[PDB]
Amino acid sequence: TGQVSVEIEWELQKENSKRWNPEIQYTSNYNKSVNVDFTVDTNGVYSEPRPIGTRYLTRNL
Amino acid sequence: TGQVSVEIEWELQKENSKRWNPEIQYTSNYNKSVNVDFTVDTNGVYSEPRPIGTRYLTRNL
Amino acid sequence: SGNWHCDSTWMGDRVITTSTRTWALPTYNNHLYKQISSQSGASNDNHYFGYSTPWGYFDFNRFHCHFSPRDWQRLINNNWGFRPKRLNFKLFNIQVKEVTQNDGTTTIANNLTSTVQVFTDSEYQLPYVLGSAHQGCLPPFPADVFMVPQYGYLTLNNGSQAVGRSSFYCLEYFPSQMLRTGNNFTFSYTFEDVPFHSSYAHSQSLDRLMNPLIDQYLYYLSRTNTPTGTTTQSRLQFSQAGASDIRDQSRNWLPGPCYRQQRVSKTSADNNNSEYSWTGATKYHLNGRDSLVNPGPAMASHKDDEEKFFPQSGVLIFGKQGSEKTNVDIEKVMITDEEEIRTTNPVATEQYGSVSTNLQRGNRQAATADVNTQGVLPGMVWQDRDVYLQGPIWAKIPHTDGHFHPSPLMGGFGLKHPPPQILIKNTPVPANPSTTFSAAKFASFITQYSTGQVSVEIEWELQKENSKRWNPEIQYTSNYNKSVNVDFTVDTNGVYSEPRPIGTRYLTRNL
Amino acid sequence: DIEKVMITDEEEIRTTNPVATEQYGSVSTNLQRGNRQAATADVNTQGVLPGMVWQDRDVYL
Amino acid sequence: VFMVPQYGYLTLNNGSQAVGRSSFYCLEYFPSQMLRTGNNFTFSYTFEDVPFHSSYAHSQSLDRLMNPLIDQYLYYLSRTNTPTGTTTQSRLQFSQAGASDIRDQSRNWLPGPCYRQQRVSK
Amino acid sequence: TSADNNNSEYSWTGATKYHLNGRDSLVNPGPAMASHKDDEEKFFPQSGVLIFGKQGSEKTNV
Amino acid sequence: TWALPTYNNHLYKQISSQSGASNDNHYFGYSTPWGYFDFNRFHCHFSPRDWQRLINNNWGFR
Amino acid sequence: SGNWHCDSTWMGDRVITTSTR
State how beta strands C219-221 and C238-240 pair.
antiparallel
> What is the rounded CA–CA span in Å between residue D26 and residue D29?
9
The residues, ordered by sequence, that sit 6+ positions from G5 with a Cβ below 8 Å of its Cβ are E3, E4
The answer to whether A57 and E56 have CB atoms below 8 angstroms apart is yes
> What is the rounded CA–CA span in Å between residue C98 and residue C402?
51
Q: Which of residues 121-140 of C touch F (CB under 8 A)?
A: none
Query: What was the experiment behind these coordinates?
Result: cryo-EM
Contacts of B27 in chain A (CB under 8 A): 22-27
CB–CB of C251 and F9 under 8 A? no
The residues, ordered by sequence, that sit 6+ positions from G41 with a Cβ below 8 Å of its Cβ are none
The residues, ordered by sequence, that sit 6+ positions from C28 with a Cβ below 8 Å of its Cβ are C52, C53, C54, C55, C56, C150
Contacts of B21 in chain A (CB under 8 A): 28, 36-39
Q: How far is residue E55 CA from its own chain's centroid?
A: 16
Q: B38, D12, B30, A59: which is closest to C35 by C-alpha?
A: B38
Segments of chain E assigned E as strands: 2-3, 6-10, 57-58, 75-77, 93-96, 110-111, 114-115
Q: Which of residues 27-66 of E touch C (CB under 8 A)?
A: 51, 54, 57-66
Chains contacting chain E through 3 or more C-beta pairs under 8 A: A, C, D, G
Whether the ω angle into residue G60 lies within 30 degrees of 0, i.e. cis, is no
For residue E73, give the amino acid letter: Y
Instruction: Give A1-61 as a DSSP string.
Output: -B---------EEE------S--------S---SPPTTS--TTS-----S---S--SEE--
Q: Helix, strand or coil for residue C91?
A: strand
**φ/ψ of residue G55, rounded to 5:** -65, -25
For residue C270, give the amino acid letter: D
Chains contacting chain B through 3 or more C-beta pairs under 8 A: A, C, G, H
Give the C-alpha distances (Å, rounded to integers) separating G4 from C294, E43, E91, G33, G37: 63, 21, 83, 11, 10
Chains contacting chain A through 3 or more C-beta pairs under 8 A: B, C, D, E, G
- Would you give the DSSP letter of residue C171? G
Q: What sign does the CA torsion over D1, D3, D7, D12 have?
A: positive
Count residue pairs from C and D with Cβ separation < 8 A.
Answer: 111
Q: Which residue in chain C has the smallest CA separation from A16?
A: C125
State how beta strands F17-20 and C353-356 pair.
antiparallel
Distance from CA of C33 to the nearest CA of B (A): 5
Return the H-helix or E-strand segment holding C71. helix C69-78
Give the C-alpha distances (Å, rounded to integers) separating C205 from C343, C344, D27: 4, 6, 28
Total residue length of chain G: 62
Whether the ω angle into residue E84 lies within 30 degrees of 0, i.e. cis, is no
Contacts of E53 in chain A (CB under 8 A): 54
10 Å Cβ neighbour count for F41?
A: 9
Q: Which residue in chain G has the smallest CA separation from B27?
A: G56
Q: Is H8 on the interface with B (CB under 8 A)?
A: no
The answer to whether C386 and C504 have CB atoms below 8 angstroms apart is yes
Cα angle: C189, vertex C190, C193; to 5 degrees: 165
**Which residues is F18 bridged to in the sheet?**
C353, F25
**φ/ψ of residue E16, rounded to 5:** -80, -25
Query: CA torsion angle for C157, C159, C162, C165 (degrees, to 10)?
Result: -30
* No. of helices (H) and no. of strands (E), chain E: 0, 7
The answer to whether C93 and C2 have CB atoms below 8 angstroms apart is yes
E103: left (phi over 0), alpha (psi -120 to 50) or beta: alpha
> What is the rounded CA–CA span in Å between residue C131 and residue C431?
38
> What is the rounded CA–CA span in Å between residue C173 and residue C33?
14
Q: Is C177 on the interface with B (CB under 8 A)?
A: no
Count residue pairs from A and B with Cβ separation < 8 A.
Answer: 42
Nearest to C297 among D28, D47, D51 (CB): D51
**Which residues is B8 bridged to in the sheet?**
H17
Q: Do chains E and A touch (3 or more CB pairs under 8 A)?
A: yes
